Amino acid sequence: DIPLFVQPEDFGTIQIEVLSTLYRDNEDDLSILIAIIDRKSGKEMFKFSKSIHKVRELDVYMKSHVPDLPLPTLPDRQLFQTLSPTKVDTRKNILNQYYTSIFSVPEFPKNVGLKIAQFISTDTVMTPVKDGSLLLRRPNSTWRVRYGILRDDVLQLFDKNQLTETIKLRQSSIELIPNLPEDRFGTRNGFLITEHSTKYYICTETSKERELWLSAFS
């Protein structure tokens, strides 16, 4: 066997939270970061990372070994084709609904329950001023994944751990971009930083993350 972090009979005692679908794993590919939480304590026990391909693989296994029991539906493949903020926001919510339903099924067959347990017991992620994954556009205007670090009153953006942008907040102005009506770029949870000029369009994965980032800007 491979060591199990949570026994299949104890799937009911955990909550899941899909934290991101822009996480860079050990091989530096975009993957899905998932947190496993103890229900009674509310403490985050561990995190793990899976590519969308691995997610569909386990899904394929389940459809075939439990055909008679209803199972949730994965996000569509089109949500992972052209990178846009509105798709990133949506597919994270569907994945949250998906894995909440999985660990809410009362009983799985012994083989299927072990496979799910092995799934969450691999690709473990250990992670210990504001930061987070961001989506960046410039005024021929595609989006690109960036990792933002707020240093003092200066924002730093990295592309695969390489400084590609550096921003002064004292020189710049900030404004929210309304989610609606949806523009021709799929902007969502977005805001504009105009550094004195130059304009950077930045979106977060959730609307809460936009709230948290603006407060860091203050």
Numbering used by the authors: 502 to 629, 636 to 646, 652 to 708, 716 to 737
Relevant lines from the article:
In this publication, we present the three-dimensional structure of the tandem PX-PH domains of the yeast protein Bem3.
In this study, we have determined the X-ray crystallographic structure of the interesting tandem PX-PH domain module of Bem3 to a resolution of 2.2 Å, showing that the putative membrane-binding regions of both domains are oriented in the same direction and thus might act synergistically in membrane recognition and binding. The crystal structure of the tandem PX-PH domains shows the well characterized folds of both protein domains. The model contains amino acids 502–629 belonging to the PX domain and 636–737 of the PH domain, but the linker region (amino acids 630–635) between the domains as well as the loops between β1PH and β2PH (amino acids 647–651) and β6PH and β7PH (amino acids 709–715) within the PH domain were flexible and could not be resolved. Even though six amino acids are missing between the two domains, the presented structural assembly within the asymmetric unit represents the only possible arrangement, and a different connectivity between the PX and PH domains is excluded because the positions of the respective C- and N-termini are too remote. Strikingly, the PX domain of Bem3 contains basic residues (for example Lys551 and Arg592/Lys593) at similar positions compared with other PX domains, which have previously been termed basic motifs I and II, respectively, and have been shown to be involved in PIP binding. Specific point mutations introduced at this position in Slm1 and the PH domain of EFA6 resulted in mislocalization of the respective proteins, further signifying the role of this arginine in ligand binding. In line with these findings, an analysis involving the mutation of basic residues within the β1PH–β2PH loop of yeast Bem3 (R644S, R645S and K647D) showed that this abolished binding of the PH domain to PIP2, rendering the protein incapable of correctly localizing to the polar site at the cell membrane. In contrast to these mutations within the PH domain, a quadruple mutant involving amino acids within the so-called ‘membrane-interaction loop’ of the PX domain exhibits wild-type localization of Bem3. Although the critical residues Lys551 and Arg592 of basic motifs I and II of the Bem3 PX domain are conserved in the majority of PX domains, their role in the direct binding of PIPs has yet to be elucidated. The structure shows that the putative lipid-binding domains adopt a relative orientation that enables them to simultaneously bind to a membrane.
